[model samples]
Target: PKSMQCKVILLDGSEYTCDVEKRSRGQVLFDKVCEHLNLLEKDYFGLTYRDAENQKNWLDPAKEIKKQVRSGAWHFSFNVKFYPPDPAQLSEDITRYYLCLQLRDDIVSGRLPCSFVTLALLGSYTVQSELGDYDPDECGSDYISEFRFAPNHTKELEDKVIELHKSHRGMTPAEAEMHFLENAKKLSMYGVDLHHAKDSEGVEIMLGVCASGLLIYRDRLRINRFAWPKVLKISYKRNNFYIKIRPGEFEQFESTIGFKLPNHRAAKRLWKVCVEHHTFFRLL
Candidate 1:
């Protein structure tokens, strides 16, 4: 017996017919569609794929395969889905759109990198959350508005790790390790909160300081969102006791302050480590 054919419709209401084998191959088409979808999502939320996984074609390293495609050329078909946002989400969406516009400019100007996609996503979140309440000040001002980290804060972070090492008092190694992991999450959370403040001006000043410091201290590095974090040490044996910053934390700060930071690849890597570990510290 012959298999039945299937039909798929697109956003334009155009329909394409195919046999079971070809219809099953919709998965391949969907993959391409998904790549485009995710690319749109990245463009939508302002996402970057640096730390995120996905291989890009020769021309663009940012692209990813969304679904699997066939070995050779074949007819492609897919159904489109469009879900409109609630009216209330409109205000937030507009803010995100505006930020994305700024991001596009920054990227084109080489002032920002594709890694900043995370920052954009976070900015979108902030726009929807707390950033909606306020607006950016004029561009020219005494106050330098941007996202950044402070050196002292790095020391504060190291101190916590040292304290954790001390906490191993009279406990088995395994027990201490477990205890440290549990406590570190709480402690790391503390670092994030400490950096969060209502002072946009102060935050901007701090960011400027951090940027200058990165140049002076890490001239060799391409300082992106997570440059500071790359300097931190994960453990005592493989020690490189420097402090780092979180992209999300920085984004939240930027949202409050109304500016973006210079995204560095080092900083991005550091953030990945920071997210993985319960606690990160530098050697004293």
Candidate 2:
């Protein structure tokens, strides 16, 4: 029998291939993958890949790896699947380091849209974590040029980062990342993972899942929210996803709202995402 060759990349864009038994499952391969990075606090990351239809999915730790390797591809990504309520909740420094990379990736890609002010501060924190200390003699005009911090950054933005770094002291690499994560968590997107859906009235909307709760967004603004305390239950049937809501402070009855997803699979996917978010953030 042949061994399955799995190629996985980290958040920093480094890629490596590891060997596993052909008969081994995703868990076994993912475990070995984690071993390569000395990773243990594994709840936040996943070995993700896309199928023939181009739908993104994570490996089923209990399922066969070969079947999941669609499009005759062996590529898999190790990425942050779930964001923690706060980075301090994580156990190890490497875990937090990777978490830093994830946020940096998101910011550079503009997925986690942030203001220029916060971007400069975050860039400083990133440099602090990477270089440890800021010394006047070691930096040049191109000091932060090699290190990317934004999609379209100006010289002043880079200068601001440098100026901010010059004022810091006595901070370890991970300590700087702690501040990075702390400040980055305040952004509007932060831990939000949005999914496309339609409200009960057939109105197009986006539902965001995060530590705060399930948020309903329309026209780029959050129009409604479902805090976990208010969500008594969640489910999906066919292409319809349902949310059982507890009555408000003034009401005594419970009600359920439904959203129409693109298809059965999409509805189920939304359901699963919500369930995972609810459990990770609420059920402990």
Candidate 3:
């Protein structure tokens, strides 16, 4: 059996090298990567790469490695794709490590939309996990200085990190990491990537689909929600996305809500998200 060197790059720019049999499945490589990182929540992370078509694709855990890879060099990214419904279900330290990695990338890239206070608190938890208890003497340390911060927000972020670290004195690194994930997961938009759309009245709205359900947002505030149980079917055509819902017993009639997206592609993507969400949360 031929073996190939797989270069796994983390979101933090750290890299780990591993060798795998050409015929092995993707999950085997995934396991090796997770074990190396000492990550606990394996299910939350996946290996993704750009295919020949320039479209991003995730390696299917069940598929053969040879099928997923091209001839010579192969690479994969370790990142978060899903958020666990319950952080308590994460039974290992390494799992929390991956969660921290995800949060760090999100914060740095501005993918996580929240107040500066929340962002500062989250950053502090990551610092605690990485550097252990904070020290006043270490304020001038290289590691502290190298930590990434949003533009013009350096001093405020640093102060918050120090304050939060002091408050978490008795907690172990593992406990602190878990607490961070638990709190971050509570945000309604936690794992969601919003898609722009408009209601029938042409009012602009943002649509997000996640393990919990379909979320409707106006700006940052979540205006409405439709859980999987309440949804009968989802379909889209042209620029119209439709949600057929199971009406309440007291209701005089059933309702099918429709939203108009910018184009066929947007509508299709929204539909795809709903399908994936339903499969992950309800069917699975």
Candidate 4:
């Protein structure tokens, strides 16, 4: 026999309790935690590669994909199809549907144990957030589930890189460099570190720049990248132009002016600024 009560006792002197329905308990608990710790709710919350206002919207999904692919996580795919129902509803010009595919490539590729992928994929879907602004009238597409690579931590990749580096210690400069390059490529595919830090101060800035580069490189991930910009808008509600780059514009810019651009000098200068000052260059 199970009974629900509106009150409960706690070890703390503050006898805080709520009368909310059982279904709403989680929300109540979240609010209580925030209140007790004086923590403010953020408009956006999640691990994101981009710090730029609109960039997170583009980055999140790709990172989500990369995360799962790298860590050998479980994945499941399904499709959503839409159609005009009846003559009164008017026949649609286009029949629309999505094809979903899910596979844990790391395990499939034999990089990790099989059981890990199944468990990780199941645990992955427990939470989700909106990745970008959706305009129902303009697009027929809906949300899709995404996961970050599993083990959900970088320690494993770092350890592998370190071990590889050690194994090449007695080799010649050219030989060791080749060894590192080969190993680093695998690490990069899985979103692991491949660059020298230079110093502790530059570590965060460099990592941020690298992650941002990855998102920008993968143009389709623009929705997730824009999530951060959406958050910035809500967080700094009074400042309309805090980082006003919009998602549409970013996508256009990325397509037109990404890695293929022929401005080596400018690109070098931009990298320098990022490395030396941890700031971005705004061209006039």
> Can you write out model 2's per-residue Cα lDDT over 71-145, one digit (the tens) per residue?
557788888878876788787989998889989988998878888889999998888888877887778887654
- Model 3 weakest 10-residue run by lDDT: 141-150
* Model 3 C-alpha lDDT per residue in residues 39-149, reported as the tens digit of each score: 655776788766564444567788886786654357888877666777667777777667767776666776666577877777777777777887778775323446664
Candidate 1 per-residue lDDT over residues 29-51, each given as its tens digit: 34344354333322112212222
Give every collision pair in model 2.
Answer: none
Worst lDDT 10-window in candidate 1 = 188-197
Report the backbone clash tally of model 2: 0
lDDT of 1 at 192: 25
Q: Give the TM-score of candidate 4.
A: 0.17
Compare candidates 1 and 4 on lDDT and give the better one.
1
Please tell me which predicted candidate would have the highest TM-score against the true structure: 2
Ranking by TM-score: 2, 3, 4, 1
Prediction 2 global C-alpha lDDT = 0.83
Q: TM-scores of the models, in the given order?
A: 0.17, 0.90, 0.76, 0.17
Cα lDDT for residue 271, model 1? 31
Give the root-mean-square deviation of each candidate in angstroms.
23.4, 2.2, 4.1, 24.3
Best by lDDT: 2
